[PDB]
Amino acid sequence: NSFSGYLKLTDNVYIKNADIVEEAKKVKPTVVVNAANVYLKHGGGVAGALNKATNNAMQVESDDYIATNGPLKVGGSCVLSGHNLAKHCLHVVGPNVNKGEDIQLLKSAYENFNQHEVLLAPLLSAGIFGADPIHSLRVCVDTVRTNVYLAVFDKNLYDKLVSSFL
């Protein structure tokens, strides 16, 4: 949890322009959040990147979790190993608003973060899930009460989020 180079947005939300895979390798946090889907199939975006950085160990573990427990619900989560990236991976499902899933569930998704004192995380429902990323940061600020270190890869998006928030 020895994070460095973050900008403090609120009492408990920090942001950095960084690849979440590189941040996890440098800090080895207690918890890294994955932007997952209900079957834990890590095909692209942040999920694909975290799974590739584990050389597919995360996907084999996720498949066994699904065969034993069934899929997650939208807004839900599960805790699995963080492999070489973290002690634990918190897999969280934000709504895919491009598929008609309710934006109301983005608040439920971020509520999962409150079970952990410190997290390294991406914005939820951004990218292929279709939510506006600045809206997703606002829900994060309004819902998360524990200490969250947000990593945003794209510099253009990062600059827009810092300008809209500060």
Binding residues (CB under 6 A) for ligand A1CL8: these are 19-21, 45-46, 49, 122, 126-127, 152-154, 157
Nearest approach in angstroms of CB 101 to ligand A1CL8 is 17
Using alpha carbons only, give the angle 97, 100, 102 rounded to the nearest 5 degrees: 65
**With respect to ligand A1CL8, which residue has the nearer C-beta, 86 or 117?**
86
Q: Which is nearer to ligand A1CL8, 141 or 157 (CB)?
A: 157
Q: Of the two residues 53 and 80, which places its CB atom closer to ligand A1CL8 in the complex?
A: 53
Minimum distance, C-beta of residue 50 to ligand A1CL8, in the bound complex (Å): 8
The beta strands (E) that lie in the chain are given as 7-8, 13-17, 31-35, 77-81, 88-92, 118-121, 147-152
Nearer to ligand A1CL8, 16 or 116 (CB): 16
User: Considering the complex, what minimum distance in angstroms separates the CB of residue 140 from ligand A1CL8?
Assistant: 13
Distance CA 34, CA 65 (A): 15
Look-up of token digits 């895979």: 21
CA atoms of 48 and 147, how far apart (whole Å)? 25
